[PDB]
Amino acid sequence: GHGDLHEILHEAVPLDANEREILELKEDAFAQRRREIETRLRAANGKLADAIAKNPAWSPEVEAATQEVERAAGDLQRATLVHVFEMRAGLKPEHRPAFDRVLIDALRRGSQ
Amino acid sequence: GHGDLHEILHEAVPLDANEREILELKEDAFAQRRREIETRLRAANGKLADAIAKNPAWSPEVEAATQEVERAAGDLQRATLVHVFEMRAGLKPEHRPAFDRVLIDALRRGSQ
Ligand SMILES: [Cl-]
Ligand SMILES: [Cl-]
Ligand SMILES: [Cl-]
Ligand SMILES: [Cl-]
Ligand SMILES: [K+]
Ligand SMILES: [K+]
Ligand code: NI
Ligand code: NI
Structure with a gap:
């Protein structure tokens, strides 16, 4: 998901x-x-669209833009999960199991 | 998007x-x-959820699962775009500009 x-x-x-x-x-x-x-991701998506508009083939421009999209998406995934762990550190300990239930179930569904 | x-x-x-x-x-x-x-992506999501269920921290298990998610997502992005180019090769030439209009606009919105 x-x-x-x-x-x-x-x-x-x-x-x-x-x-x-x-x-x-x-x-x-x-x-x-x-x-x-997210600003970087939108810009990368725009570079990918531009590349294909210019020359609709795999190309150095498509290779670079695809990589830039991937990099931004991965940065966002990782930053989000680091911040999820920040949230957990700031919870009262007794609140952590419910938080984890929601987190685990959502991760299994592909939430990011 | x-x-x-x-x-x-x-x-x-x-x-x-x-x-x-x-x-x-x-x-x-x-x-x-x-x-x-997609089967690989679902499995990676499940490994990430498992890792966090076991130990809810960045961890070798989280690092590996995150990387596996990223790799599968990137494989899917690239495979899809290669197949989009296969589709374009199989079109009558006169159909390619309309196809490209839809493709370009959708890429700019983050479709993958
Ligand atoms: Cl809140
Ligand atoms: Cl709780
Ligand atoms: Cl069709
Ligand atoms: Cl056309
Ligand atoms: K995640
Ligand atoms: K794409
Ligand atoms: Ni937060
Ligand atoms: Ni197709």
């Missing part, structure tokens, strides 16, 4: 009042990072 | 009767290949 892992967790197992206070800095930092990587 | 590039093209700019005859072998080969890579 194509689930939004970060959103799934904040919606299904929301932070409590104190956890939200604790996590606010790291949540903001991640929001900025997600936006930056 | 998360568009299904292959489906978008077959639905919006379907093959004509003779093109469909010409392309049937390669379409079947691609259907089998897509299924194989």
